[PDB]
Design a protein around this ligand. Structure first.
Ligand SMILES: Nc1ncnc2c1ncn2[C@@H]1O[C@H](COP(=O)(O)OP(=O)(O)OP(O)(O)=S)[C@@H](O)[C@H]1O
Ligand SMILES: Nc1ncnc2c1ncn2[C@@H]1O[C@H](COP(=O)(O)OP(=O)(O)OP(O)(O)=S)[C@@H](O)[C@H]1O
Ligand SMILES: [Mg+2]
Ligand SMILES: [Mg+2]
Lengths: 344, 353
C-alpha cells in the first residue's frame, strides 16, 4: 500500500532533482493503485484515467524515471520505442504491438495485462512537421497518431499470438504515460508570449523577457503550443496531465556523481574493488569533470565519456600492477597534465 | 412487446450526455425504428423496410464516442465498436472490413441469426478519407481503400466471416452473415471540414474597389458552419460520393459552451467532479467543489480548445498538490476548493477534525 511520499523517496534514490515531475508520476501511480483495488467504487461511479506527457531535453532523465519507477511497480510494465510504429496497412509494426509487448511481462494473461502500465518514449518524433495533412498520408507522424487516438481509451484490441485466435484485451484500465524530447518546442511557447506588437510607429512595443532557460519556457507550455508543434488536438486531449523537466546545471551534475545509488563514481569504485584496489574521487576532481561536460554540451551522458578517458590509462595497468592499496583522483589529472596518484 | 419510445430512451441518454439535442433525437429515432423493423422481420406488407445509416460530425470532446457507449447499454441487440484506422484494404496485413462482423458475432455468442439484427459504431470514420489530391494517383489502402471495401458492407452484402477468432481454428464451412439489416453508425471528428463549408456558403472576394466584399475578420464561428453541412462539402473533404450516399441522415454536434461545461460537471451520472470525490473518499477524506470554483475551471477549459477533455487537466492540476500530501497528512476530514484556488493564487483549503 505505497503512498505518494513513499514513492517519492524511492524514486529520489536513483534520480535526483526534477521535483515537479516526480510529484506528477508519484500521484498518478498512487491513484492507479486505488482504482485497480476498487473498480465499481461501491457507488456506481466509473473512475477514469489521466495520461501523462513528459517534455524535457535529452539527457534529463525522462527514461530514467520510467526504469527506476518500474522496479517499485508491482503490476506488469513495458517500454515502447514510438519510432518503429507504423499505420495500419504498412510494413513495420502496428500500434497494437504495445499491448502485446506488455503481455511479455504478464505471462500472457489478459486479467493481469488489463491492470498493467504502459510507457511510450520518443513521442515527439511521431508528429507532423507540416502541422497539416501532406500530399501523401504520413505513415510515421500522422498515421501513428491517428491510431493512438482511439488506443489510449478503451477500444478492446486484439492480441496477435507471438495462431489466429487474436485474444481480446481491454485497454480501458491500462494507464498510459508519454514522454519525448520535443526539440524546438521551447521556441513555440516563446513565440506565443514573446512579441505581440508591430514594427512602425504607433505600436504597443513590449519588452522582451530576459534570457530564460529552456526549463522556464516549458513550464508555460499549453495545449495550444502543442497543436502548433505538430500534434493533432485529439491526441493532446488524451494526455491531460502535462509535466516538464529542467536542464541539468553545474550543481545538478555534481550531485548526480555521488548522490545517485547507481552513479558512475560508485560503479567504478566497485569495479576497482573487484580486482583488489580501492578508488576515491576528490571533491575538486568531481567539479572539474562536471564543468567539462557542460562545456562540450554532451550533457549527462557525457559524464561517462570524460571519466573513461581520464582513467583509461590507469585501468590499463591497474590489474597488472601489484602491491597497490588505493588510487587518488584530483583536479590535476582531469585535464591530463598530471598522472593520477598511486600508492603501494 | 414493450418497445421503448424515443422520448424514454432519450431521457436515459441525457443522464450520461449533456448539451446535445439534435444528435440525441436522431439516434433515438433510428434505434426506435430498428426495433420496429425487428418485429416485422417477415415484412408482412409488400414493401420491404430498409435502413438509414447515421453520420456524426463534430469537434473533439463533443460526446460522439460517449453517445455510442451509453446507448449500447440499452441496446439489447449485439453492439460492437470498431476503429477505422486499423482497417485497411483487403489483401493486406491490416485488419479487413470483415473483422467488424466477426467482433459482433462474439457479442451474440456465435449466433449468426442474432448478428443479422445488430448495430455497429465505426468510430474515427473521418480517418479513412482521401487526403490531398483526391484522385490518389497512388494506391491507397488505409484511406480510400477502406471506403471502397465498406461500400458493399455498409449497404448490405453476404460476407463469409472466418470461423476463427474464439471458435474452431481448423478450416471448415465459413459462416455466412448478411449485413442487409445491420444498422451502421459512423462517427468521427472531421478536422478542417469547417474551412471547406465556409468556402461554399460564405462568399469570398479578392482585392478591388467596387463589387468587392471586405468580409471582416469577425464573422460566424465554425459551429454555425458545421450545422449547415451539405454532402457536397463532405465529398470535397475526401469522401467518395458513393460512400457518403450510404449515410443518408447526418447529425452534427455543437461545441460545448461555458454553460454546457458546468452542467457536465455535476448533472452526468459519471461526472468529473464526482469521480474525484469518490477517489478522495477511498482514503477517508471528503471532497467538495464550490459553485464559484466550477465556473473558473469551465472558463479556463474553453481556452484549452480540447473539448470536454480539458476539464480533466484543469481539475488535476489544481488538485495536484492536494493529492500528493493528503494521504501523508492525518486528521483530515474534508477539503474545500474555492475560486481563489483554481487560479493558483491561494492553496487549497483544508479542515482538521
Ligand atoms: N537527472 C539525472 N540524474 C541522474 N542521472 C541522470 C539524470 N538524467 C540523466 N541521467 C543519466 O543519463 C542516462 C541517460 O539519460 P536518459 O534517461 O536516457 O534521459 P533521456 O532524456 O530520456 O534520453 P532520451 O530518452 O534518449 S531523449 C541515464 O541512464 C542516467 O544514468
Ligand atoms: N456531452 C457530454 N456530456 C458529458 N461529458 C462529455 C460530453 N462530451 C464529452 N464528455 C466528456 O469527454 C470524454 C471524452 O468523450 P468522447 O466522446 O470520447 O470524445 P470525442 O468527441 O469522441 O473524441 P473524438 O472526436 O472521437 S477523437 C467523456 O468521457 C466525458 O467525460
Ligand atoms: Mg529514452
Ligand atoms: Mg471517438
Amino acid at each position: 500500500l505505497p503512498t505518494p511520499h513513499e514513492i517519492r523517496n524511492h524514486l529520489d534514490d536513483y534520480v535526483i532533482g526534477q521535483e515537479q515531475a516526480k510529484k506528477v508520476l508519484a500521484v498518478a501511480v498512487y491513484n492507479h493503485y486505488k482504482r485497480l483495488r476498487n473498480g465499481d467504487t461501491s457507488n456506481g461511479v466509473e473512475l477514469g484515467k489521466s495520461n501523462i506527457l513528459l517534455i524535457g531535453p535529452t539527457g534529463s532523465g525522462k527514461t530514467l524515471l520510467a526504469e527506476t519507477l518500474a522496479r517499485l511497480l508491482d503490476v506488469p510494465f513495458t517500454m515502447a520505442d514510438a519510432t518503429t510504429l507504423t499505420e495500419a496497412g504498412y510494413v513495420g509494426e502496428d500500434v497494437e504491438n504495445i499491448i502485446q509487448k506488455l503481455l511479455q511481462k504478464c505471462d500472457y494473461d489478459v486479467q493481469k495485462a488489463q491492470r498493467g502500465i504502459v510507457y511510450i518514449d520518443e513521442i515527439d518524433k511521431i508528429s507532423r512537421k507540416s502541422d497539416n495533412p501532406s500530399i501523401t498520408r504520413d505513415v510515421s507522424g500522422e498515421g501513428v497518431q491517428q491510431a493512438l487516438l482511439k488506443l489510449i481509451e478503451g477500444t478492446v484490441a486484439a492480441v496477435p499470438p507471438q495462431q489466429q485466435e487474436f485474444l481480446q484485451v481491454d485497454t480501458s484500465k491500462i494507464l498510459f504515460i508519454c514522454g519525448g524530447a520535443f526539440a524546438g518546442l521551447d521556441k513555440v511557447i516563446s513565440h506565443r508570449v514573446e512579441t505581440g506588437s508591430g514594427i512602425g510607429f504607433g505600436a504597443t512595443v513590449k519588452a522582451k523577457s530576459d534570457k530564460a532557460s529552456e526549463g522556464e519556457l516549458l513550464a508555460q507550455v499549453e495545449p495550444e503550443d502543442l497543436i502548433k508543434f505538430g500534434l493533432i488536438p485529439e491526441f493532446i486531449g488524451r494526455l491531460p496531465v502535462v509535466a516538464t523537466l529542467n536542464e541539468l546545471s553545474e550543481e545538478a551534475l555534481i550531485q548526480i556523481l555521488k548522490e545517485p545509488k547507481n552513479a558512475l563514481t560508485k560503479q567504478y569504485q566497485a569495479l576497482f574493488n573487484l580486482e583488489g584496489v580501492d578508488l576515491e574521487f576528490r571533491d575538486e576532481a568531481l567539479d572539474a569533470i562536471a564543468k567539462k561536460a557542460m562545456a562540450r554540451k554532451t550533457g549527462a551522458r557525457g559524464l561517462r565519456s570524460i571519466v573513461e578517458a581520464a582513467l583509461l590509462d590507469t585501468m590499463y595497468d591497474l590489474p597488472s600492477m601489484e602491491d597497490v592499496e588505493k588510487v587518488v583522483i584530483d583536479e590535476s589529472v582531469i585535464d591530463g597534465q598530471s598522472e593520477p596518484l598511486l600508492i603501494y
